[PDB]
Amino acid sequence: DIQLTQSPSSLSASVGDRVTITCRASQGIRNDLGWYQQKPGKAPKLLIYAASSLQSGVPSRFSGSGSGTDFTLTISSLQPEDFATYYCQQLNSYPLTFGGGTKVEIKRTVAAPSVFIFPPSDEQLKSGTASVVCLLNNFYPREAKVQWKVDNALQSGNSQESVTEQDSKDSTYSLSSTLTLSKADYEKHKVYACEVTHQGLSSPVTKSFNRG
Amino acid sequence: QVQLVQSGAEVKKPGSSVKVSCKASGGTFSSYAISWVRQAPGQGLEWMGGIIPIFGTASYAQKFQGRVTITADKSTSTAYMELSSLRSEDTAVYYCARVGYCSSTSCNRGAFDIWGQGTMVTVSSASTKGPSVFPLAPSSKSTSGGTAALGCLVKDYFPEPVTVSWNSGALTSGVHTFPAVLQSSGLYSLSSVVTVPSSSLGTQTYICNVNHKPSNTKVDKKVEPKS
């Protein structure tokens, strides 16, 4: 089976600069390579077929080259709409193999997170469950660590988190983490806190509250 | 400019089968082949198989051979992808796509120029369940100099997805709805927050509009400050 190694796996870039993505096949495939673009929540889009041929409608800022093993997708001057995931694909033999993909994010300045915390609603408490939500709002880069501490005791296995896609306007990320305990276990303890470690923070910041 | 219209989302138990349709809209299949591609949540793209509608000739990735059947009704230009013995690892979005440009070796292999909107298929032992919507009340522990945070907690629902708006679409600024997380119970859960001016907490009404189509569930939750 023809193996496609797409590099790099991800890159950060500003609007207007040169971006190069390489795809390498485990064996010769002539010019049977396709390039695709995909936005979150949408179907992939054909950019380039036959290694270099531009699909009708696709801007000329996208340029594919290469023949045999080494192929390259070059984007000459990045536009806002070009920030997405790009996929390699070989058209030569079965099975039709795709590359691993390249995530192109927007490069901006280091932004500290606004950290907020939400105690469980009374509506949920009377259902038997308690959920505390910690919000990290509008930060960059997306790498961030959140840790829950109940009565200054580090928590583990009872929290889950998700990060939104990069905002197309201010290029930031946001994180939401949910700590979930039972009604009984919740009332057993006093202080609930989430600790946040981020590059834009000089030191780990703690937002907390007491039952009351 | 032919379009590819696929059948709606699918919720299946482990071990069962699913059959997704792919119909040509505003055109025909003509002399073009139709491939199938799936994508698991957070994962990349993967070819499953394809078919030549005119001849009914089908090819498959060896990974799925024995569990997959790709047919095509030429009288209506509708391709089909049947996947049996469904496992949880089959939870993915399934796309159909037209082979618009022949490769150097054949015409059932080539670049996919036209794609369908995709079909979400979820395989789980969990049963369909509407969400419990809890408010994320704004307070001093959610206020930072003129701006206050508030939101909705959409907990314990199945399956994906849920859509949440604020004030019936009127409030869009500063809104962040996070991707759902899969709990150990097999149920999904997400949050939706919005930053608003801290001075409006005494007058402005903020309502969470949570929609869950698979369970026919609509919930409106008014978020008020807690004190």
Added chain:
Amino acid sequence: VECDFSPLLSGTPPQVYNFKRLVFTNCNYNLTKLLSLFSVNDFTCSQISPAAIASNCYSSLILDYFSYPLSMKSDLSVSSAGPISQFNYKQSFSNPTCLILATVPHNLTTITKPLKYSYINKCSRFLSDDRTEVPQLVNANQYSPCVSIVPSTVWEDGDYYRKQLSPLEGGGWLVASGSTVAMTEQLQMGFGITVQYGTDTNSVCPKLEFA
């Protein structure tokens, strides 16, 4: 004086849909010597016998050869409604014919093996109405219309071939499909012989033996 079968013994023999044809007139042949270089697995004839076709004089002798897997023997009969006799190769009806299935021995290295066996499985015209499909059945002593869009060796089994036709060429599409058969350890071939008798021009005679 003597009929030359040398082009057969050299190079890579084509697939069935691209059969190579030799036409012999005014020469003397030794059929037995040609077959002695091969391992004849099957030898059947129509309106003539194997013994007689190696010992008669004709006005013309036609020899078609191609790479062919021994396993699909029955497919190489017009009695069968297979894709081979429908889309690839079809011998004459109004003339005596013979069909030989042989295997190349290891000591005949001059004949090289193709990458694999392959044949045309489907061959049709797809009209400009995007509905009606017209299968293009191969005629006797002729090639498939789809030999222009089917490569000399099919890359993958069940491959699809499609070519758009100009209004002058009837418009619509020329559409074909090809199958593959894995290559055997020793190269296996098929031979199609067709003879035609005349009145005075019967000069294709068997090579007689003298002291």
